[PDB]
């Protein structure tokens, strides 16, 4: 009943600010896929797809102006609300391959973490319980209608029988960091 | 000439 | 053989567990375990022409896979999955879930496949004087559901704080019934009943009794 | 530790049609709670909660701010739709990759579950159907939900409980608009 249907829906810019710590973020998403985002301190527009940046251009100064006005909005709200509590929720992860798994061929393992609140989370990868960081991609925090957030991480790896991969998640709303193990076949 | 037209998102501000 | 049967109160989450006995194991060997659950809504009566289907399955990676329309009720606790437990958790008790359920748990070494039956028992409390009671008149309440076996113990309670009501000269208890001969205005409020069984089935059904 | 707080602001453009009907909704969120909401059907900032009463009133006492927000329906939503979004979303083409997998085999004459993996496709109206020797099957079929890969591509897995003899061949059939004729992948036993 709360959901309304449209042919296409675009957020055309999502602003997120967290206090204290001054955690800012500004993205640009359309119909589920992230078009691009705006870097905080580098003052530049970073496109998720490189071909998307060959035809359109967004001014990141408006990105910094809106994240500053969101900072002011949260500042005056926290000053006016006085003593109001904030809640935490534990996220849920899911590990899956990008393409069909073929042993010996390079593939990309994706770790999808949903229901992230607050959006402060460490998403790491472990190869045979060992720390690994070879081409670890992380998208920006997409937004859900539950006002929670969902992010995705990428690992380009080689599927082999002697390798078992797990995705580790460290969150403020988790009493211990949880690890989702995975071994194909 | 082809241009990279893209309108920005416009926020707002309260006083409080 | 002789598949066990489990009852369920409509509108209340039902516990459908199945764990591998109780030996403490290495969690690393526990995360590498797939699960498949199938259901066949059936009955002794000719409900089918005289069919099974896969409701949900999750590979160790954590991905869901089920019937084309997503079932919003079933949501695995995930915690119990990492605690040597595979349990079906639906939030609303579906009245259309009356049937047979089969399991498939796949591990690199051993493997178990539990199986049982589910029957939906709509629980309700029926009053003999249907309506608002007078200033002083009799009243009878019978709380039960569609179950052949008789309850072993029945508890009653009054008020929103759930104060257990005992047998009194004005509070008569017999089997699964409650009767009050004179209903004073103080007897108004939420009166509830709790049932028990040999399998430990609790049914806490309430009813708002209004006196003149 | 101590008091943490999260703030969010967004403005959604709903396109029920192409250029006929456009809708604009701005949302302000504090601690996963919305407190100020503007709708293009309303025409002014309304307070969804009492906390957002003075703030919305500040946006209701400024005529230039209200006219700017009303004009954002055409300068932010429609302008981006007819320009960049038409040139960066409609132009992005895709092709689904359809493969076939099998959990267990053995003699295959026993019970079995065939898998059809359709990966790396842009989300659209897809009709995936299982066919045994040319006839569509619906019983025992179990397909995953729309899995968002997050990189503009999608993925889906369909499963069919295949019991009949090895002598028969199975096939997966998918109907995606990016491909003119539905690609058909066959698997022999
Ligand atoms: C995440 O990692 C950082 C260091 O990179 C650490 O300071 C922080 O405590 C970790 N966890 C959380 C929940 O912030
Ligand atoms: C009264 O409740 C009992 C068990 O609590 C149930 O078996 C019976 O059908 C109910 N109705 C009657 C006796 O009319
Ligand atoms: C009934 O009692 C048992 C035993 O204490 C308890 O575990 C169970 O949760 C109760 N049932 C319900 C449906 O609350
Ligand atoms: C959508 O817009 C087009 C172009 O103006 C128009 O022909 C069509 O009728 C509209 N759709 C509906 C459902 O009115």
XYZ file of C-alpha atoms and ligand atoms in Angstrom:
658
model
C 0.000 0.000 0.000
C 2.908 2.319 0.796
C 4.672 1.483 -2.489
C 3.763 3.396 -5.653
C 4.741 2.044 -9.067
C 6.402 4.006 -11.866
C 7.964 3.100 -15.201
C 11.342 4.456 -14.063
C 12.517 5.897 -10.746
C 15.705 7.847 -10.105
C 17.083 9.181 -6.834
C 19.289 11.691 -8.718
C 21.508 12.137 -5.687
C 21.440 10.716 -2.158
C 23.070 12.592 0.729
C 24.156 10.819 3.926
C 25.816 12.479 6.922
C 26.813 10.941 10.257
C 27.820 12.769 13.438
C 30.177 12.677 15.250
C 33.163 11.878 13.023
C 31.842 13.954 10.089
C 31.018 11.008 7.824
C 29.715 12.402 4.532
C 28.612 10.643 1.356
C 26.873 11.699 -1.861
C 25.863 9.296 -4.641
C 23.780 9.209 -7.830
C 21.615 6.159 -8.546
C 18.898 5.310 -11.074
C 16.542 2.306 -11.028
C 18.817 0.262 -8.769
C 22.174 0.675 -10.507
C 24.605 3.292 -9.210
C 25.301 5.803 -11.972
C 28.106 7.558 -10.069
C 29.005 9.280 -6.808
C 30.905 12.357 -5.622
C 34.149 12.024 -3.687
C 34.193 13.859 -0.363
C 37.647 15.434 -0.015
C 39.010 14.872 -3.537
C 36.306 17.163 -5.011
C 35.665 14.977 -8.053
C 32.832 12.967 -9.595
C 33.633 9.241 -9.713
C 31.570 7.188 -12.164
C 30.830 3.534 -11.454
C 30.972 2.760 -15.184
C 33.715 4.479 -17.215
C 31.592 4.683 -20.373
C 28.923 6.578 -18.419
C 31.450 9.379 -17.899
C 32.025 9.762 -21.650
C 28.610 11.388 -22.224
C 27.488 13.176 -19.019
C 29.139 15.421 -16.443
C 28.036 16.371 -12.926
C 29.434 19.349 -11.020
C 30.914 18.040 -7.739
C 30.846 21.514 -6.160
C 27.082 21.157 -5.874
C 27.872 17.819 -4.266
C 30.019 19.485 -1.611
C 27.439 22.242 -1.113
C 24.655 19.724 -0.485
C 26.740 17.610 1.895
C 27.579 20.801 3.795
C 23.921 21.819 4.025
C 23.121 18.288 5.214
C 25.820 18.732 7.865
C 24.128 21.957 8.971
C 20.738 20.217 8.980
C 21.981 17.405 11.219
C 23.802 19.913 13.423
C 20.735 22.026 14.164
C 18.615 18.888 14.567
C 20.959 17.297 17.114
C 21.086 20.644 18.933
C 17.281 20.921 19.021
C 16.427 17.278 19.779
C 18.554 17.408 22.975
C 18.478 13.843 24.385
C 17.125 11.461 21.739
C 18.302 7.854 21.290
C 19.580 6.104 18.176
C 19.139 2.399 17.443
C 21.423 -0.152 15.798
C 20.587 -3.090 13.534
C 22.699 -6.132 12.668
C 23.327 -6.589 8.923
C 22.895 -9.769 6.892
C 25.413 -10.927 4.286
C 25.226 -13.151 1.210
C 28.146 -14.438 -0.886
C 27.634 -15.363 -4.543
C 29.695 -15.427 -7.754
C 29.226 -12.852 -10.491
C 29.520 -15.268 -13.431
C 28.978 -19.051 -13.558
C 31.784 -20.765 -11.667
C 34.345 -22.479 -13.907
C 37.345 -24.013 -12.150
C 40.553 -22.438 -13.438
C 38.970 -19.355 -15.033
C 39.173 -15.948 -13.299
C 35.873 -14.898 -11.736
C 34.534 -12.248 -9.345
C 33.094 -13.146 -5.939
C 30.499 -10.691 -4.610
C 29.597 -10.164 -0.940
C 26.214 -8.443 -0.562
C 25.505 -7.008 2.902
C 21.951 -5.766 3.501
C 20.208 -4.044 6.425
C 23.258 -1.960 7.346
C 22.458 0.614 10.028
C 24.372 2.746 10.852
C 26.346 2.749 7.569
C 29.708 2.121 9.270
C 30.943 -1.363 8.378
C 34.219 -3.150 7.614
C 33.771 -5.646 4.761
C 36.880 -7.807 4.358
C 37.762 -10.992 2.490
C 39.653 -14.076 3.660
C 41.280 -16.691 1.412
C 41.695 -19.973 3.325
C 41.340 -18.037 6.604
C 44.196 -15.772 5.445
C 44.067 -12.019 4.926
C 43.848 -11.175 1.220
C 43.468 -7.863 -0.605
C 44.089 -8.339 -4.346
C 41.701 -6.139 -6.321
C 39.061 -5.672 -3.619
C 36.312 -3.392 -4.937
C 33.594 -1.833 -2.787
C 30.559 -0.012 -4.135
C 28.859 2.824 -2.306
C 26.068 2.273 0.217
C 22.821 1.844 -1.693
C 19.650 2.828 0.175
C 16.633 0.660 1.008
C 13.074 1.737 1.761
C 13.616 0.502 5.342
C 16.097 3.435 5.591
C 18.779 0.761 5.979
C 21.612 0.406 3.468
C 23.083 -2.377 1.339
C 26.626 -2.513 -0.047
C 28.461 -4.936 -2.322
C 32.128 -5.944 -2.367
C 34.065 -7.595 -5.192
C 37.012 -10.003 -5.222
C 38.624 -11.157 -8.461
C 39.872 -14.661 -7.658
C 40.733 -18.028 -9.210
C 38.386 -20.885 -8.185
C 40.476 -23.888 -7.156
C 39.857 -26.983 -5.061
C 42.505 -26.032 -2.475
C 40.979 -22.578 -1.859
C 38.008 -21.720 0.363
C 36.792 -18.118 0.492
C 34.857 -16.336 3.237
C 33.489 -12.805 3.632
C 34.026 -11.153 7.024
C 31.742 -8.371 8.275
C 32.559 -6.098 11.228
C 29.740 -3.808 12.355
C 28.837 -1.675 15.359
C 25.571 -3.593 15.763
C 27.303 -6.984 15.779
C 28.548 -8.411 19.073
C 31.196 -10.291 17.074
C 32.335 -9.963 13.449
C 30.552 -12.653 11.432
C 32.140 -14.637 8.592
C 30.190 -16.314 5.776
C 32.213 -19.219 4.393
C 31.923 -20.514 0.834
C 33.455 -23.350 -1.186
C 32.259 -24.218 -4.710
C 31.477 -27.868 -5.460
C 28.171 20.516 -30.740
C 27.466 17.602 -28.404
C 27.642 18.525 -24.722
C 27.466 16.581 -21.462
C 24.194 18.007 -20.193
C 23.325 16.858 -16.667
C 21.234 18.878 -14.213
C 22.373 18.801 -10.597
C 20.373 17.847 -7.518
C 19.188 20.794 -5.439
C 18.857 20.454 -1.639
C 17.228 22.855 0.825
C 18.026 24.400 4.197
C 16.056 24.958 7.399
C 16.689 27.468 10.177
C 15.709 25.679 13.419
C 8.163 -44.214 8.606
C 5.136 -43.003 10.590
C 5.968 -39.370 9.941
C 5.437 -37.162 13.018
C 2.757 -34.478 13.040
C 3.121 -30.942 14.406
C 0.245 -28.540 15.030
C 0.219 -24.786 14.450
C -2.020 -21.993 15.734
C -3.108 -19.700 12.900
C -1.625 -16.221 13.178
C 1.258 -17.309 15.427
C 4.835 -18.178 14.376
C 5.331 -21.950 14.481
C 8.603 -23.621 15.470
C 9.753 -26.188 12.884
C 13.245 -27.267 13.975
C 15.591 -30.007 12.813
C 19.192 -30.199 14.047
C 21.857 -32.896 13.740
C 21.492 -34.523 17.193
C 23.708 -32.526 19.594
C 27.467 -33.026 19.024
C 29.618 -29.902 19.239
C 31.325 -29.449 15.869
C 33.806 -27.142 14.171
C 31.956 -24.050 12.871
C 34.115 -24.051 9.724
C 32.686 -27.454 8.779
C 29.240 -26.136 9.740
C 29.165 -23.171 7.338
C 29.704 -25.617 4.439
C 26.236 -27.129 4.491
C 23.342 -26.809 2.067
C 19.655 -27.100 2.919
C 16.564 -27.875 0.828
C 12.971 -27.928 2.086
C 9.951 -29.210 0.162
C 6.234 -29.132 0.949
C 3.243 -31.089 -0.368
C -0.081 -29.663 0.861
C -2.203 -32.782 1.250
C -4.842 -34.383 3.444
C -6.718 -37.622 3.937
C -9.719 -36.066 2.218
C -9.671 -35.692 -1.576
C -7.970 -32.291 -1.540
C -5.916 -33.366 -4.591
C -7.361 -34.959 -7.718
C -5.671 -38.370 -6.805
C 1.502 -32.154 -5.253
C 4.937 -31.349 -3.862
C 7.045 -28.251 -4.446
C 10.256 -26.591 -3.279
C 9.580 -23.660 -0.948
C 13.139 -22.550 -0.141
C 16.714 -23.797 -0.507
C 19.981 -22.142 0.535
C 23.444 -23.226 -0.583
C 26.328 -22.642 1.876
C 27.065 -19.343 0.113
C 23.861 -17.973 1.629
C 21.726 -17.502 -1.503
C 17.977 -18.119 -1.546
C 16.180 -20.280 -4.105
C 12.482 -21.131 -4.027
C 9.085 -20.879 -5.695
C 8.729 -18.018 -8.179
C 6.513 -15.918 -5.853
C 8.747 -15.116 -2.893
C 7.444 -16.410 0.432
C 7.765 -13.469 2.870
C 6.906 -15.602 5.912
C 9.887 -17.969 5.743
C 13.017 -16.148 6.925
C 15.799 -18.363 8.260
C 17.254 -16.999 11.492
C 20.779 -17.446 10.031
C 22.046 -17.413 13.628
C 20.697 -20.919 14.183
C 22.201 -21.957 10.851
C 25.609 -21.041 12.301
C 24.664 -22.891 15.520
C 24.091 -26.362 14.069
C 20.363 -25.858 13.517
C 18.085 -25.808 10.460
C 14.635 -24.483 11.381
C 11.697 -23.134 9.393
C 10.611 -19.726 10.710
C 7.441 -18.151 9.329
C 6.104 -15.005 10.969
C 2.382 -15.512 10.151
C 0.996 -19.034 10.556
C -0.302 -19.846 7.080
C -3.627 -21.672 7.018
C -2.620 -23.097 3.615
C 0.473 -24.819 5.065
C -1.435 -27.949 6.144
C 0.532 -30.785 4.564
C 3.787 -32.751 4.598
C 7.315 -31.338 4.815
C 10.551 -33.060 3.791
C 14.141 -31.941 4.321
C 17.581 -32.335 2.763
C 20.729 -31.220 4.607
C 23.953 -31.812 2.670
C 27.356 -31.801 4.397
C 30.764 -32.873 3.019
C 30.783 -35.938 5.310
C 27.408 -36.976 6.762
C 23.854 -36.024 5.794
C 20.417 -36.090 7.420
C 16.930 -35.639 5.948
C 14.160 -35.024 8.476
C 10.475 -35.219 7.564
C 7.154 -34.591 9.306
C 3.623 -33.209 8.906
C 2.007 -29.854 9.677
C -1.636 -29.217 10.583
C -3.045 -25.714 11.054
C -5.254 -25.442 14.128
C -7.144 -22.146 14.287
C -7.283 -21.204 17.975
C -10.209 -19.175 19.296
C -12.209 -18.594 22.476
C -15.984 -18.863 22.038
C -18.421 -17.288 24.502
C -21.829 -18.760 25.291
C -23.460 -15.327 25.884
C -22.412 -13.690 22.610
C -22.451 -9.948 23.262
C -22.005 -7.483 26.106
C -22.912 -8.889 29.511
C -25.624 -7.391 31.697
C -25.001 -5.940 35.157
C -25.371 -9.442 36.636
C -25.724 -12.609 34.550
C -23.928 -15.853 33.772
C -21.118 -16.272 31.238
C -19.140 -19.160 29.744
C -15.842 -19.193 27.839
C -14.330 -22.132 25.934
C -10.892 -21.637 24.367
C -9.705 -24.366 21.995
C -8.649 -25.158 18.434
C -8.971 -27.973 15.894
C -7.042 -30.694 17.729
C -8.296 -34.180 18.676
C -6.124 -34.711 21.758
C -7.427 -33.041 24.927
C -5.320 -30.481 26.818
C -3.626 -31.574 30.027
C -3.609 -28.219 31.855
C -5.537 -25.004 31.190
C -4.674 -21.637 32.743
C -6.734 -18.446 32.845
C -5.761 -14.861 33.615
C -7.419 -11.455 33.907
C -6.375 -7.924 33.038
C -3.745 -6.489 30.730
C -1.097 -7.414 33.323
C -2.119 -11.103 32.972
C -2.918 -11.971 36.583
C -3.522 -15.756 36.725
C -7.099 -16.521 37.757
C -7.618 -19.494 40.079
C -10.735 -21.440 41.024
C -12.892 -19.234 43.268
C -16.449 -19.390 44.633
C -17.257 -16.933 41.817
C -14.723 -18.339 39.300
C -15.681 -21.890 38.288
C -13.249 -24.030 36.282
C -14.122 -27.371 34.685
C -11.974 -28.963 31.948
C -11.352 -26.076 29.496
C -14.185 -23.776 30.589
C -14.546 -20.645 32.712
C -17.808 -19.413 34.225
C -18.774 -16.431 36.384
C -22.334 -16.343 37.806
C -22.381 -12.636 38.725
C -20.257 -10.400 36.488
C -19.431 -7.280 38.484
C -18.155 -4.214 36.584
C -14.703 -5.036 37.995
C -14.671 -8.190 35.834
C -14.347 -6.098 32.663
C -11.067 -6.221 30.769
C -8.911 -8.634 28.801
C -9.375 -12.240 29.943
C -6.954 -14.735 28.426
C -6.394 -18.498 28.391
C -3.243 -20.611 28.024
C -3.298 -24.240 26.869
C -0.776 -27.060 27.211
C -0.261 -30.494 25.673
C 1.964 -33.565 25.731
C 4.139 -32.041 22.989
C 4.179 -28.676 24.772
C 1.870 -26.640 22.525
C 1.097 -23.275 24.121
C -1.960 -21.310 22.987
C -2.363 -17.885 24.623
C -5.639 -16.499 23.246
C -7.279 -13.407 24.750
C -10.783 -11.942 24.731
C -12.047 -8.494 25.751
C -14.964 -9.033 28.139
C -17.218 -5.976 28.479
C -19.667 -5.697 31.385
C -22.534 -3.178 31.600
C 29.934 4.372 22.772
C 28.337 7.807 23.141
C 25.558 9.434 21.093
C 25.724 8.684 17.362
C 23.330 10.183 14.817
C 22.643 9.691 11.104
C 21.036 12.145 8.669
C 19.768 11.585 5.132
C 18.329 13.731 2.337
C 17.014 12.622 -1.047
C 14.770 13.694 -3.905
C 13.089 11.104 -6.121
C 11.713 11.658 -9.632
C 8.944 9.170 -10.445
C 8.384 8.728 -14.194
C 5.092 6.895 -14.656
C 5.378 7.588 -18.399
C 8.079 9.097 -20.595
C 7.352 12.827 -20.698
C 3.609 12.884 -19.936
C 3.410 12.491 -16.142
C 6.309 13.309 -13.809
C 6.281 13.210 -10.006
C 8.761 14.761 -7.568
C 9.152 13.847 -3.886
C 11.816 15.179 -1.507
C 12.453 13.336 1.758
C 14.363 14.326 4.897
C 15.426 11.508 7.232
C 16.847 11.742 10.762
C 17.905 8.531 12.533
C 16.005 6.318 10.062
C 12.931 8.514 10.642
C 11.407 10.791 8.012
C 10.327 14.181 9.372
C 9.921 16.507 6.340
C 8.339 15.503 3.023
C 7.527 17.464 -0.135
C 5.284 16.093 -2.881
C 4.700 17.479 -6.364
C 1.003 16.636 -5.998
C 0.820 18.663 -2.775
C 2.869 21.658 -3.913
C 4.427 22.538 -0.547
C 6.572 21.035 2.195
C 4.419 19.138 4.696
C 5.484 17.794 8.087
C 5.066 14.019 8.178
C 5.988 14.237 11.879
C 5.492 17.026 14.400
C 9.280 17.396 14.650
C 9.280 18.760 11.098
C 6.580 21.373 11.660
C 8.815 24.490 12.007
C 11.284 23.411 9.318
C 8.556 22.859 6.720
C 6.980 26.161 7.782
C 10.271 27.885 6.944
C 9.995 26.425 3.434
C 6.338 27.541 3.297
C 7.053 31.192 4.186
C 9.602 31.673 1.377
C 7.988 32.127 -2.064
C 11.252 31.951 -4.021
C 12.229 28.660 -2.367
C 8.801 27.156 -3.066
C 8.821 28.277 -6.707
C 12.337 26.879 -7.122
C 11.247 23.519 -5.694
C 8.178 23.495 -7.951
C 10.358 24.304 -10.969
C 12.696 21.447 -9.995
C 10.024 19.129 -11.416
C 11.061 20.340 -14.889
C 14.645 21.532 -14.316
C 15.870 18.489 -12.348
C 13.514 15.619 -13.224
C 12.372 16.300 -16.794
C 15.635 17.939 -17.886
C 17.671 14.948 -16.711
C 15.161 12.497 -18.203
C 15.111 13.957 -21.725
C 18.872 14.546 -21.801
C 21.436 12.505 -19.869
C 19.222 9.654 -18.649
C 17.907 8.977 -22.160
C 21.495 9.026 -23.475
C 23.113 6.903 -20.728
C 20.433 4.369 -19.684
C 18.634 3.584 -22.948
C 21.967 3.445 -24.797
C 23.425 0.872 -22.376
C 22.868 -2.517 -24.030
C 23.210 -6.010 -22.590
C 23.078 -9.698 -23.512
C 22.119 -12.461 -21.047
C 24.545 -15.352 -20.583
C 22.574 -18.600 -20.251
C 24.367 -21.734 -19.037
C 23.244 -25.099 -17.666
C 24.461 -26.891 -14.531
C 23.703 -30.087 -12.617
C 23.980 -30.636 -8.867
C 24.072 -34.456 -8.951
C 24.264 -36.913 -11.831
C 25.025 -40.611 -11.122
C 22.947 -42.734 -13.531
C 20.577 -39.723 -13.899
C 17.659 -42.144 -14.226
C 16.852 -41.378 -10.573
C 15.561 -38.067 -9.221
C 17.551 -35.034 -10.350
C 17.409 -31.230 -10.341
C 18.552 -29.338 -13.445
C 19.816 -25.760 -13.094
C 19.694 -22.902 -15.613
C 21.933 -19.929 -14.792
C 21.099 -16.680 -16.602
C 23.812 -14.204 -15.614
C 25.137 -10.781 -16.632
C 22.016 -9.064 -17.933
C 20.428 -5.672 -17.392
C 17.150 -6.076 -15.474
C 14.004 -6.175 -17.601
C 10.849 -8.218 -18.163
C 12.171 -11.768 -18.614
C 10.109 -14.920 -19.180
C 12.121 -18.022 -18.242
C 10.514 -21.406 -18.887
C 11.646 -25.022 -18.644
C 10.985 -27.343 -21.585
C 11.279 -31.141 -21.658
C 11.442 -32.435 -25.252
C 9.629 -29.244 -26.311
C 6.820 -29.221 -23.720
C 6.796 -26.614 -20.961
C 6.910 -27.818 -17.353
C 5.683 -25.877 -14.324
C 5.648 -28.526 -11.589
C 8.824 -28.799 -9.538
C 10.125 -25.499 -10.943
C 11.962 -23.200 -8.530
C 13.571 -19.929 -9.643
C 15.588 -17.509 -7.535
C 14.602 -13.872 -7.112
C 16.046 -10.994 -9.126
C 19.610 -10.854 -7.781
C 21.081 -7.352 -8.028
C 24.803 -7.676 -8.726
C 25.205 -3.940 -8.074
C 27.296 -3.433 -11.237
C 24.350 -2.651 -13.563
C 24.016 -6.373 -14.358
C 21.658 -8.950 -12.840
C 21.573 -12.712 -12.309
C 18.985 -15.457 -11.811
C 19.011 -19.224 -11.248
C 16.137 -21.514 -12.244
C 15.766 -25.147 -11.202
C 13.690 -28.027 -12.586
C 13.334 -31.465 -10.994
C 14.182 -33.706 -13.967
C 13.214 -37.353 -13.369
C 12.671 -38.888 -16.884
C 15.054 -41.230 -18.676
C 18.490 -40.320 -20.027
C 17.152 -40.833 -23.564
C 15.317 -37.506 -23.317
C 17.020 -34.123 -23.672
C 16.132 -31.029 -21.650
C 16.351 -27.358 -22.553
C 16.186 -23.954 -20.869
C 14.240 -21.155 -22.567
C 14.556 -17.460 -21.684
C 12.782 -14.451 -23.224
C 14.649 -11.168 -22.692
C 13.949 -7.965 -24.669
C 17.635 -7.224 -25.339
C 17.692 -10.310 -27.592
C 15.402 -10.371 -30.623
C 14.695 -14.137 -30.650
C 14.682 -16.116 -27.377
C 17.948 -18.001 -26.986
C 17.481 -21.698 -26.211
C 20.131 -23.762 -24.404
C 19.931 -27.558 -24.629
C 21.429 -30.223 -22.364
C 21.768 -33.920 -23.207
C 21.777 -36.736 -20.666
C 36.842 -0.949 11.160
O 38.220 -0.813 10.894
C 38.823 0.344 11.444
C 40.260 0.411 10.971
O 40.310 0.353 9.566
C 38.697 0.329 12.971
O 39.167 1.527 13.544
C 37.232 0.184 13.360
O 37.062 0.051 14.746
C 36.650 -1.055 12.681
N 35.275 -1.324 13.043
C 34.231 -0.476 13.163
C 32.947 -1.156 13.569
O 34.264 0.732 12.971
C -14.686 -26.618 23.861
O -13.286 -26.748 23.977
C -12.854 -28.089 23.850
C -11.420 -28.209 24.316
O -11.036 -27.030 24.981
C -13.070 -28.530 22.400
O -12.702 -29.876 22.206
C -14.549 -28.407 22.053
O -14.783 -28.609 20.684
C -15.098 -27.024 22.431
N -16.521 -26.884 22.167
C -17.637 -27.480 22.666
C -17.526 -28.544 23.738
O -18.747 -27.170 22.259
C 4.939 -23.311 25.583
O 5.859 -23.730 26.573
C 7.145 -24.144 26.169
C 7.875 -24.677 27.382
O 8.191 -23.611 28.246
C 7.847 -22.951 25.532
O 9.135 -23.288 25.075
C 7.029 -22.548 24.319
O 7.570 -21.427 23.669
C 5.582 -22.223 24.685
N 4.902 -22.089 23.425
C 4.595 -20.928 22.814
C 3.875 -21.076 21.496
O 4.867 -19.830 23.274
C 2.789 8.373 -22.552
O 3.232 9.425 -23.379
C 3.074 9.188 -24.767
C 3.765 10.293 -25.540
O 3.122 11.521 -25.292
C 1.581 9.054 -25.087
O 1.355 8.745 -26.443
C 0.998 7.918 -24.257
O -0.394 7.820 -24.408
C 1.289 8.138 -22.776
N 0.827 7.019 -21.998
C -0.363 6.971 -21.372
C -0.632 5.699 -20.608
O -1.181 7.877 -21.411
